[PDB]
């Protein structure tokens, strides 16, 4: 937990920057920053007004952007910051008071009805979401899915995962259930398309395994975990990160997505030698919860993707791997492969952890490291 003030009141870390003032002094809602929408609009939360507001480009610079990136958990990564036309819809903005000096951003920002530079801050903390431009799919080219990794125990591919920083991989919590919760069991293989080239010495050691604290193995609710590598990955054409999704992606009800992995290419089949990938459509949770599909097993922390006719789907071997979508010319991580009855059967689409609802936890973990 986290301490509010000197009086000793503790709150759950999930109650930190969640819109509700759980501290009498509002500390838990007084230092809240996020990136909004597919153009990464930097926004700061106002506990008084109970609302999020973009930052004016006025007097902003790279040092403020790096500070903000650190506060979000990205450590020393910084990609870019520029002023843009606000596409977030907002109607009041945060402006830097230059006359006040050396205070942190939150003490220096104030509410303003207009920005003098007529632009708001767009901030990217890491270069991500760029690539080279499973049942029912086809073999992937080098660099097509450069965030894709293969996770091994005992010289066997067990799960997939997605690179989000040089050190951090998103995967599924059920991959790392005991007795596989020990990081020393795991090796991560990046940039390699063939399982036969994933041998001792070719991969990366894992330092930490963190499962979602509300993971329920009985229902597979909150099926997400983080792996931290012992060394930073070197990025290149073949190994690069996928972007984490921002509030306000505004995805379509049946948004077009891609899944990739070494999962069996047929139910009860063996791990594919080569990386494959396929297109799937999102399926609305209300339709996924039909008595003819998963009959109320789909929780708000899950999303469905595939085709209710079947034919194309993830399978055994794909757990933890990416479900991604392209928007604003950026690839975003929308889900992690979690569960699904059979493989590619009609009325049994794939179920994925809903990464949007986990992003705040992910940031907290990266920041706490």
């Amino acid at each position, epitope marked *: 937990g986290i301490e509010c003030d000197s009086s000793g009141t503790c709150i759950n870390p999930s109650n930190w920057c969640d819109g509700v003032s759980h501290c009498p002094g509002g500390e838990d809602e007084n230092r809240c920053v996020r990136l909004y929408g597919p153009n990464f609009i930097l926004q700061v939360y106002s506990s008084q007004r109970k609302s999020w507001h973009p930052v004016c480009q006025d007097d902003w610079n790279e040092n403020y952007g790096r500070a903000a990136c650190r506060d979000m958990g990205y450590k020393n990564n910084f990609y870019s910051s520029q002023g843009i036309v606000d596409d977030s819809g907002s109607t009041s903005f945060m402006k830097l008071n230059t006359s006040a000096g050396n205070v942190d951003i939150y003490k220096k920002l104030y509410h303003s009805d207009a920005c003098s530079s007529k632009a708001v801050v767009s901030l990217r903390c890491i270069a991500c979401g760029v690539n080279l431009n499973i049942v029912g799919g086809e073999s992937a080219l080098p660099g097509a899915w450069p965030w894709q990794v293969s996770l091994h*125990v005992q010289n*066997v*591919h*067990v*799960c997939g995962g997605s690179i989000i920083t040089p050190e951090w991989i998103v995967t*599924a919590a*059920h*991959c790392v*259930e*005991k*007795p*596989l919760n020990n990081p020393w069991h795991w090796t991560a293989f990046a940039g390699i398309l063939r399982q036969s080239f994933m041998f001792y010495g070719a991969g990366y050691q894992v330092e930490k395994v963190i499962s979602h604290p509300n993971y*329920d*193995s*009985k*229902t*597979k609710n909150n*099926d997400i975990a983080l792996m931290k590598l012992q060394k930073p990955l070197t990025f290149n054409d073949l190994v690069k990160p996928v972007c984490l999704p921002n509030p306000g992606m505004m995805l379509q009800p049946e948004q077009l997505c891609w899944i990739s992995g070494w*999962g*069996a290419t047929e*139910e*009860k*089949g063996k*791990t594919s030698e080569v990386l494959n990938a396929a297109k799937v459509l999102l399926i609305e949770t209300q339709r996924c919860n039909s008595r003819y599909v*998963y*009959d*109320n*097993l789909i929780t708000p922390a899950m999303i469905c993707a595939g085709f209710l006719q079947g034919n194309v789907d*993830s*399978c*055994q*071997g*794909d*757990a*933890g791997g990416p479900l991604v979508t392209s928007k604003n010319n950026i690839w975003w991580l929308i889900g992690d*492969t*979690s*569960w*699904g*009855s*059979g*493989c590619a059967k009609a009325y049994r689409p794939g179920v994925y952890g809903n990464v949007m609802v986990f992003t705040d936890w992910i940031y907290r973990q990266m920041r706490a490291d």
Partner: nanobody
Amino acid sequence: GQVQLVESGGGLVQPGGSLRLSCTSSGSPLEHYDIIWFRQAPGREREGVSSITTSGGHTNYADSVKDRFTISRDNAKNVVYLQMNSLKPEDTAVYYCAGRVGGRRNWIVPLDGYDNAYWGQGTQVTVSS
């Protein structure tokens, strides 16, 4: 709906005999669930004896029952089976099925997974002369 597991096939047999346990479900089809058979005899600790994934592609056995027991499933018939051959007095126990929503990882279902699972009512197995 929440899955409701129901085991059957237990009963009294002599040493050396066989039984076929089976488990079906109401509320939610068994096809969605990884299944662990565990057993408990009065006075002793619970013991996971066999497990199987939703697809049937990974099975798992306690050393004490390997070669004698065989787990399998039929999703179209909504049933999971435990064939138990060459039974011994030490196999006497109530046998339970435990289910979890099954994941897509490429690994066995651990035998101690009944500790967080849906459970059936159990079926008594007695092996004696």
